Structures are given as C-alpha cells and as structure tokens.
Design a protein around this ligand. Sequence first.
Ligand SMILES: COc1ccc(Cl)cc1-c1nn(C)cc1NC(=O)c1cncc2cn[nH]c12
Length: 280
Amino acid sequence: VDPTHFEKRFLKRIRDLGEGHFGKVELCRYDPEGDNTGEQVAVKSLKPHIADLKKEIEILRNLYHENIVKYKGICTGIKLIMEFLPSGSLKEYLPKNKNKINLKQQLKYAVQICKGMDYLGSRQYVHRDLAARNVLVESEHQVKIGDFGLTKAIETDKEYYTVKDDRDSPVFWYAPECLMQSKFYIASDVWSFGVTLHELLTYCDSDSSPMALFLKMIGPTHGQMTVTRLVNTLKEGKRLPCPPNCPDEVYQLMRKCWEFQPSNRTSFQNLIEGFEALLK
Ligand SMILES: COc1ccc(Cl)cc1-c1nn(C)cc1NC(=O)c1cncc2cn[nH]c12
C-alpha cells in the first residue's frame, strides 16, 4: 500500500476552506475505518486546468521545508492532499488575533516567509502569487507558504520565466517587469514579499489593502488604464506608504524589495539578515 495514495470513497468532505477562480480547498477527513476517527486533510481540487494542477502536485511533492505546507498525497482528474492548518491564512487570522500578535512576532513571520521563499528560489522556482492570502498559519509562532497554483520553473543560466497567460494576476503585488513584459524573476518574488510584508504589518486590514492603497494613489476611475497608471506611479518612484505604527527600519527593509530594477532589490538571504538584526 502507498501512503500517498488516498481513495476517494474514504475522503469525506467536512467544509469548504476557500476558493479561487478555478480551484478550491476543502477540509476533509480521510476516514477508511468509517467511524470519523481519520485524519483531517486540506484537499485542493478544480471546480467543474487539470495540466496545471498536476504540475502544482509535482512541485509540492518535491518541496520539503518547515515553512512550506506539507504534501500528503493525491486522490486520482486529480485532487491534491495536504496537511490541514486550522488557523487558515494570514488574511483571515491577523484581523482576529491583533491582541496575540505583536511586532516581534510579525518580524519572525517575515523571516519565516523569506526562508520558505529562499528554499523555493534555490529549487529554481518562481512563485508569482506571494500574498498574505497564500501564507498559512501553523500556530501563533509559525507560518508556511500554503499554495503553489501559479508556480513556474526558471530555466538554468536563464534569470526569468515569461508567462503566456496573465488572466488571473494579482497586479497590485506584481513588480514593474511582470506588469510590462510578463517576466518573472526571483527578484519579482522579492517585490511581492515587500507587499505581503505591508499586509502582515497592517494585520491584513481590508481598508489598507495594497489594492485600496494603490487605487487612492492612482485614482479609482481609469478602468482598463489601471495597470498602465500603476506602472506610471511606480516609474515616478511612488510606493505603498509606511504602515501605521511600523518603525522606519522595518519600512526601509520593505522599500528595498521595491527597487524598480530587479538587480537593485535586496535578496531573500539579505532580508533574513535584516530582520534578525532587528529582532536581536
Ligand atoms: C492558501 O489558501 C488557499 C489557497 C487556495 C485556495 Cl483555492 C484556497 C485557500 C484558502 N482560502 N482560505 C480563505 C483559506 C484557505 N486555505 C486554508 O485554510 C488551508 C488550510 N490548511 C492547508 C491548506 C492548503 N491550502 N489551503 C489550506
């Protein structure tokens, strides 16, 4: 028997966890004994794109890191089986736990995301969807990168992957090169980290979201010119403001993620040293 092969007949749905445009994550119990004693697992499936989910499954199967959600297996069409993290994402957790989470804990979460991202980077992968909604909460002390739906492999001796299909893109988290030429470098993930760091520092407050803040800067009435206006503001050197109660030294580390040219951005290794210096 293969412990990574899950039988559909024993995979019992409890409740929905969340959904995207094409994919959904559900809480299930894998109950072969039929008595509700089986382990609870997170299950990713496509709504009634199979090729992309199969590639996501193979990517996650070969990632092994404390700050990366654990692959458990598959249910053959296919479903992706992972460990279940009941606290859900930072987007859902932080607004409900401001009393539990202080700056020091926010900076440790920041270091944790950089380590998981730095490991993905070392495996020649670009995430392309690094946002707080994709960071899962293991406990009040630990976070994990929780989804790899847009992840792509960067070729050896090549510095980026060029994306053909940009239809479901989080443009308010995207670096200028991604917006202008659909070019995804590891430095593009560093740009997205800075935006995810802004979210985490504002406790994922809806009124202060990256989307809300940028629309206040560029104007909300440009329709189809919105990405063009976004690129214009970025070219002008304009950036997301300092989160309230965020010290300048943390803001300055965030500003280095957003250097217009990919080459001038601080790397994940560099950011880790930065946060650890502030924690000590
Ligand atoms: C990263 O999260 C998502 C990614 C894609 C989709 Cl389609 C939904 C969610 C989602 N939305 N929300 C609101 C919560 C989600 N997920 C969880 O709570 C969850 C818990 N334990 C383990 C895993 C693995 N993937 N997701 C997990």
